[PDB]
Amino acid sequence: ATQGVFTLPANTRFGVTAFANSSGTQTVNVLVNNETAATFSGQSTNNAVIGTQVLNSGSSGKVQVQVSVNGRPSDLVSAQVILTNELNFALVGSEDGTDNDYNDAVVVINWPLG
Amino acid sequence: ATQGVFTLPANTRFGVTAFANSSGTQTVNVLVNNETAATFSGQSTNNAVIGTQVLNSGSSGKVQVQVSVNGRPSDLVSAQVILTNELNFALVGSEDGTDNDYNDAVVVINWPLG
Amino acid sequence: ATQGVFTLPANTRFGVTAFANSSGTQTVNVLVNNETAATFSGQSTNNAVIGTQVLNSGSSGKVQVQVSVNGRPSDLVSAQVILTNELNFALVGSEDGTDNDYNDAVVVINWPLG
Amino acid sequence: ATQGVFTLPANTRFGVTAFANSSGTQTVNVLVNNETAATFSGQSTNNAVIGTQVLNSGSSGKVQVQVSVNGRPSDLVSAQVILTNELNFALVGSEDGTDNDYNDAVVVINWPLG
Amino acid sequence: XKLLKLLKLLX
Amino acid sequence: XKLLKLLKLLX
Ligand SMILES: *C(=O)C[C@@H]1O[C@@H](C)[C@@H](O)[C@@H](O)[C@@H]1O
Ligand SMILES: *C(=O)C[C@@H]1O[C@@H](C)[C@@H](O)[C@@H](O)[C@@H]1O
Ligand SMILES: *C(=O)C[C@@H]1O[C@@H](C)[C@@H](O)[C@@H](O)[C@@H]1O
Ligand SMILES: [Ca+2]
Ligand SMILES: [Ca+2]
Ligand SMILES: [Ca+2]
Ligand SMILES: [Ca+2]
Ligand SMILES: [Ca+2]
Ligand SMILES: [Ca+2]
Ligand SMILES: [Ca+2]
Ligand SMILES: [Ca+2]
């Protein structure tokens, strides 16, 4: 299935934060309405935050996370979870290699803000 | 129901990161095996990261998140999500006031690391 | 925080299914915009399906699950999970006693159908 | 990433229930420790329960859900969610065609029971 | 199954 | 229920 794609409420601010756990330098692209809105990059084997940013979901609300390492797209896993019918998390893991830890870049999208 | 308590795999490194979305200064306490292991304190209404740290779940694996503002405990909501049977998120929202947005401190615990 | 309340898309068909795991007879009420739309009743300590039904989420999309045992409200826990940005589960557990298993009635709401 | 595979605690009774929403007849195979433990079949476009059963996760705790339509494997999506650190849902969606509703067979595993 | 085939002899 | 109750005391 498609992974890393989420329909947020339209015209809504959200946070996006990426962590790295890999020998490889991670590139995390965040698309809003199919256009790049943020790009994070970095390298860590110790969960460092390689980017955090507040974006607006725009008229469509469509947000997509893509991760690349070594010039190849990582395999993605994702889900959205809602707590108390209010607090939203859109979660992405990614695998750049063969160990299937799916933590090589971890991306957390959260809303609402403020 | 109890919220903000998670049984992690024992003796396992995990990341804990807090974001703030409130006019109140947030104090996030992270307990491992019932003892304080990290404390984050900060203020933001724009989802700023007020703390991030790598901890070890210890022999019990018990991890507990508490949130307070001006010494008053916030009301917590939480859940654990596992993707592809490997990538774990323990998620906490908290409410320090009356608007029930539950984002006043948002805490993300992720494992495995590395 | 409030539990057992979910905002579905308006005017949308959904499944609701309840399972029982308790010595107490479970009464599961499903409200659509604050009016009883279905009620399930039964007793099982072996996860028997005590009801399954298709309902329409109505004008508001607001669906609330209440669980009681001999009229006494159980404590609820809940969350919503979305897979591949398409498949939605609204999940409820409930506790009628002292063992904190939260399975005494388990309610699963799923959409879309068809 | 692999989907539909879950590590339950060893020797634990769990419920597995499947719903159908497709013109294609769904076959849901539940494997425990890599051996078929239950098979459900049925056809509905109205969320009918095509099977519900209690199984034991056995010595390994490994439970795998496979979905096929006349022997053709469907695309799977899955996640595990834990509420109040006690109540476990393992969730599967599946897609037998092109519309990406992922409801064609919906499978819910829940534990603990009793 | 049933659906796609009917959208197939169409659009 | 009474199942737990029966051994609330018996236990
Ligand atoms: C390449 O080395 C693999 C890579 O980096 C490792 C340190 C580990 O994080 C692994 O998961 C990652 O794919
Ligand atoms: C065949 O028509 C496709 C199939 O059945 C439809 C009725 C609908 O449920 C679709 O999602 C499913 O893949
Ligand atoms: C009363 O016995 C308590 C009750 O029923 C038990 C059999 C068990 O399912 C428990 O979780 C439930 O609260
Ligand atoms: Ca990896
Ligand atoms: Ca890694
Ligand atoms: Ca608030
Ligand atoms: Ca707030
Ligand atoms: Ca109970
Ligand atoms: Ca029970
Ligand atoms: Ca389909
Ligand atoms: Ca379908």
Author numbering:
A (entry chain D), B (entry chain C), C (entry chain A), D (entry chain B): 1 to 114
E (entry chain F), F (entry chain E): 102 to 112
Task: Copy out sentences from the published article reporting this entry, exactly as the authors wrote them.
Membrane disruptive α-helical antimicrobial peptides (AMPs) offer an opportunity to address multidrug resistance; however, most AMPs are toxic and unstable in serum. Here, we investigated 31 diastereomers of the α-helical AMP KKLLKLLKLLL. To establish whether the CD signal observed with diastereomeric AMPs was indeed caused by α-helical folding, we prepared derivatives with their N-termini acylated with an α-C-fucosylacetyl group for crystallization as complexes with lectin LecB,67 an approach which we have successfully used for oligonucleotides, cyclic, bicyclic, and linear peptides, as well as for peptide dendrimers. X-ray crystallography confirmed that high or low α-helicity as measured by circular dichroism indicated α-helical or disordered structures independently of the number of chirality switched residues.
